[PDB]
Design a protein around this ligand. Structure first.
Ligand code: 2NC
Lengths: 99, 99
């Protein structure tokens, strides 16, 4: 699709069989989701945002759908204010910015 | 242009007579710039994201040129770790997300 920016670019995602809302975020390197259970082992990661740094859990090779488009990749889980879909998965679905 | 998302989408902006580099952030409601002088009255604002909140100064009716495209709107100034172009200005330059 084409998504304009007059409103927040919120989409539905599917992860772990569950539908969630998330923000398409070109300003995010990574994909960060609120607390949930994911399978397998995780590794530690520190990430930064507008207000400082937080610790998250890094899960690799997670199956995720973004607005109906299939991706398989890294998902960070931790105390983000909002679920964000970042560039690691936006590149898998072929997303670009255009003006 | 078409901007891919393999790397951070950085652009040059001109604001207040100065050139700066800034991140195109579809996940940002507002435009947030590191400390600089701007004309006119301001009022304080708290803005949040990963890591919590920072205090900024809100300036209205600021003219800005983003990768060569002129727009006018509100600009927030304060201790942001990165200069951010948010949706309030991205709409004005006609920026969309496409996949
Ligand atoms: C979580 C809230 C929504 C998404 C977030 C994305 N902003 C980018 C800004 C760029 C960094 C300061 C971000 O945090 N990106 C992170 C996301 C986490 C991630 N890992 O992907 C990032 O890429 N972090 C990199 C570090 C980038 C460093 N950059 C640099 N040195 N130049 C990282 N690997 O940790 N938006 C925001 O932080 C904005 N928040 C908002 O728009 C709204 N706030 C809330 C809470 O929704 C509004 C109600 O204020 C701020 C700027 C105010 C207008």
């Amino acid at each position: 699709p084409q998504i304009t920016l007059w409103k927040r670019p919120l989409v539905t995602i599917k992860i772990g069989g569950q539908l969630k809302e998330a923000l398409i975020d070109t300003g995010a390197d990574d994909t960060v989701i609120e607390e949930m259970s994911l399978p397998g082992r995780w590794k530690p990661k520190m990430i930064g945002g507008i207000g400082g740094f937080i610790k998250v859990r890094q899960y690799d090779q997670i199956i995720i759908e973004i607005a109906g488009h299939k991706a398989i990749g890294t998902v960070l889980v931790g105390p983000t204010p909002v679920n964000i879909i970042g560039r690691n998965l936006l590149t898998q679905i072929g997303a670009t910015l255009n003006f």
